[PDB]
Design a protein around this ligand. Structure first.
Ligand SMILES: [Ca+2]
Ligand SMILES: [Ca+2]
Ligand SMILES: [Ca+2]
Ligand SMILES: [Ca+2]
Lengths: 577, 577
């Protein structure tokens, strides 16, 4: 159990520059005590001064009231909220209610990060409860909300909904595999319909969850990025410079396209070479695909590093815009590196495979090859992700008065900050696989379902012991990933459909693509209309109802009288008629 | 000038049933005086008792305050508003603030309608000002808002925006006609882009106008229809009965499809017969098209009567749903009766004209025919609409103490109530023509532009003298017509494109259709994003800003001190390091 410590700051103090660190440290303590936070300083590991800060209940209550009033201002209207408020008062510059200690913008370059402490007593209980169940009720998601903020709870709710909705993919995929053979248009139509209904129902459930948790309209609120650099003060930046920096993303995009496409082209060429000339023992015929998948995490990580460097050099005023741009770049890179192989196999080799002949000549036809390639690109990448996610940190950690608490905090500081965008990206990639290439191997979704049941626990374990406690945040939605999902769905509505024509056989292909796209749009509109007729609206309506309960013309008008003589002349005129 | 009379009620009193009319009349006077309205009764024409009602300023001010409070409840927050409030207090049943005098539901079957008086002094000035100008400023639309409510102002603003945006259609249509010959893909792409940008900019301007007029969120408010009939009281109706009545619209739809399609098929067959066998004098070769257009208003009117009868027999709880259903039916019928001829000419006769040969045999090839057919279906239907709109009521009216004021009101009562859905339907049909068939005749849009300049005045004149004063209403948007417009745009993105392939020549047609649709979607997303970066938001933000300003752990924490000894041990640990 913790000692009531709310937040911990590292403040590494290296031997070099040991003349301004003390001044920065004393300024940090003075500023942090100015906002009224109790502090305690202890030693750490490798010349570090770990400072633990906590809350005078009157000031905390005043801050909570101010935050609630601010939320009421924007129309928005527990451990997570308290920790969030403490972090906000720690981070918000001293301009209005806080003291700037951001480790990026101002002079606080000697601190690593500010993180909340992790409670092992709750963590072990949560892990045991989640691993001893089969399905997760809303109480578990509510507990995740109350402990690890709103973003983590939103991600876990999305994962649970996706895993639950994947049960029908597996159902009719197994049905098609057992009976409908391979490359059936009906399976593609059912997959598109499921993607549409899943997207719409997830949006509805997400709005319901936002209403329940009281985080409606949080996305509208804009939070300034401390790392943002301005030039004038109207804190403004020239948009021309921003678009100039953005234009750098284009040549990077084409360069990565060329590099990855060339790599996949050579791998495909050599694999078809060895499949055509080597008798082998089947399994060895697709070994380059497994090798490419195994190497995918390294190049993906270096590409994510390059993308995050580009985003950091791209000045963004607010947190939301920076996050959206980073998500867009990461999604583009992952889509590329995880789908170009299948795209080349399906829409390049299958329709016209005579263009790869020069590669075969340098080294020294079967529609069914895409099915095996999709089987591999479904089974093995999730295994590699599992290995790099859960079991390799296990190996790394196995390789390595109140002193035990200090040792626990010191070991916690080395743990990297847990991020949610990575898990969202993995889930979006899996959904794209399902929506775009399940026709080649209908069983694939089923496998993903199994993986999801592990992931919904495994990622939880990733939060527990392999990472430090995430900083609570409020997000109205899951972010731009939402839109990304829709895009993938639309792409599936073409992609899989075209595959059905390509692996079973010009005019027919275009007709099938057009029909599938129009059917996708029709069912999208139909499901949107159906869900428009159906939660949180009743609670909002009840809240709204409860708040609710909380001279010619003078002679003409002075002709006879008021009411009585009027009806007198009424009967008079009736009789005259 | 009027005598200060606010509203007028007819209350026809025929010779038959002259025993309950007097009781109904006395009940009407008592109920209307209960809500505090001065009344005056005079004779009319053909056994009618015209009653004029006006407002005690205290009660009117109280009603205005109550209405403003109700608008504040729903988040929404001049002669038109005053007249609307008077009509609301006249119509709202006596359950809460009013007295039910609706001429449909309750016993008030002896009254024709309740209408506001028309001011000729303002009307003649407005007509002269609009006819003496070239372009209309926002002041004219504001005056229309303050006089004839919000729906009329919204319609006139939409017409003005559409006429202004039609100037580029005419520009590049004349450019293509002079240089690019006929059936150019570039013209189709430009037409689709213009449709997209016009739709998006009209939505933006419409939101801006709603913000300016303070009618934001009015569409969310639901108004009960007095004619609605219920069975239980939870005022509810079984949805199964409603869908059973709705299902009747399907066989009616196919029956009208069959009838109109057969009529157009015979007309086309006979016109091609006479064009192939009769030397004539060209103009006489398309005479059946002119005859069909001239007969179109009669069948369109009978079909609108059938559709409104079906809608009336279809019980709708609220005004908004009833209006949406009626608009949907009317739009479907008009789309059918005004576009099936062109659709048959373009996508049936041109691709495979050998199926009409049996009709030619019973009676007893050229891509360029669609251009002439579109020329006729652009020039002559607007002429017929003009004839049936402005000049025929002119002929009808030429054929036919304070007594002159009474005579003026009596002549006003015979005038039919002006509706806006008809003008919206005409404009939507014109926009559909432009978006779907301008490739056949690029000059068509230009002609429409000219007509619009007349229409923006002519329809105004239709309000002035050929119809009674419309009852003011608030509408947040232009209604389901909005969505209809989008549909037409999408259809154009296919239709015109296909025409380009059909009049210039299977795989190519499908490729062109797919490319045009995808280009339309791409520019739609691009224009939506561009407009998302750009009004009323600043005023809302300023209003929002203005409203804003309106024991181990005890020993651990009690280790040394508060601030000072903390920094003492801070330097101590720094030195120890
Ligand atoms: Ca995983
Ligand atoms: Ca994961
Ligand atoms: Ca007209
Ligand atoms: Ca009109």
């Amino acid at each position: 159990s913790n000692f009531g410590v709310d937040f911990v700051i590292h403040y590494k103090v290296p031997a070099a520059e040991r003349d301004e660190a003390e001044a920065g440290f004393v300024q940090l303590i003075r500023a942090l005590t100015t906002v009224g936070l109790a502090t305690e300083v202890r030693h750490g590991e490798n010349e570090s001064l770990l400072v633990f800060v906590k809350v005078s209940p009157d000031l905390f209550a005043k801050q909570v009231y101010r935050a609630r009033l601010g939320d009421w201002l924007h129309g928005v209207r527990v451990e997570a909220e308290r920790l969030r408020l403490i972090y906000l008062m720690i981070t918000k510059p001293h301009n209005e209610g806080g003291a700037g200690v951001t480790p990026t913008n101002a002079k606080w370059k000697h601190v690593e990060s500010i993180f909340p402490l992790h409670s092992h007593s709750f963590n072990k209980e949560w892990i045991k409860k989640w691993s001893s169940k089969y399905t997760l009720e809303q109480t578990d998601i509510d507990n995740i909300r109350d402990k690890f903020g709103e973003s983590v709870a939103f991600y876990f709710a999305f994962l649970r909904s996706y895993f639950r909705f994947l049960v029908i993919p597996s159902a009719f995929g197994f049905g098609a595999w057992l009976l409908l053979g391979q490359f059936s248009y009906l399976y593609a139509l059912l997959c598109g319909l499921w993607s549409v209904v899943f997207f719409e129902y997830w949006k509805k459930q997400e709005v319901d969850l936002a209403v329940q948790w009281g985080v409606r309209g949080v996305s509208s609120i804009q939070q300034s990025r401390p790392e943002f650099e301005w030039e004038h003060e109207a804190k403004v930046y020239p948009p021309m410079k921003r678009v100039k920096t953005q234009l750098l993303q284009i040549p990077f995009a084409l360069a990565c396209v060329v590099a990855l496409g060339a790599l996949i082209v050579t791998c495909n060429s050599l694999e078809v070479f060895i499949n055509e000339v080597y008798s082998g023992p089947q399994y060895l015929g697709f070994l380059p695909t497994i090798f490419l998948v195994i190497g995918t995490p390294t190049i993906s990580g270096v590409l994510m590093g390059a993308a995050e460097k580009l985003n950091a050099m791209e000045n963004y005023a607010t947190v939301d815009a920076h996050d959206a741009a980073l998500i867009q770049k990461q999604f583009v890179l992952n889509f590329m590196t995880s789908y170009m192989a299948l795209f080349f196999t399906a829409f390049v080799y299958i329709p016209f495979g005579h263009i790869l002949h020069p590669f075969l000549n340098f080294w020294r036809i079967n529609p069914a090859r895409i099915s095996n390639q999709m089987f591999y690109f479904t089974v093995t990448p999730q295994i590699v992700n599992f290995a790099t996610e859960v079991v390799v940190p296990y190996i790394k950690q196995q390789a390595f008065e109140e002193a035990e608490f200090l040792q626990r905090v010191r070991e916690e500081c080395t743990l990297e900050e847990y991020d949610v965008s990575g898990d969202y990206r993995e889930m979006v990639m899996q959904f794209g696989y399902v929506a775009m290439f399940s026709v080649a191997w209908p069983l694939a979704a089923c496998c993903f379902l199994v993986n999801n049941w592990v992931e919904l626990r495994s990622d939880a374990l990733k939060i527990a012991i392999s990472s430090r406690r995430p900083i609570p945040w409020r997000t109205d939605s899951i972010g731009p990933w939402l839109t990304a999902l829709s895009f993938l769905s639309w792409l599936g509505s073409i992609t899989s459909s075209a595959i059905v024509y390509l692996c079973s056989n010009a005019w027919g292909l275009l007709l099938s693509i057009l029909f599938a796209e129009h059917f996708y749009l029709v069912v999208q509109l139909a499901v949107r209309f159906v869900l428009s007729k159906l939660p949180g609206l009743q609670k909002e309506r009840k809240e709204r109802f409860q708040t609710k309960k909380r001279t010619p013309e003078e002679m003409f008008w002075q002709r006879q009288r008021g009411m009585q003589e009027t009806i007198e002349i009424g009967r008079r005129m009736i009789e005259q008629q």
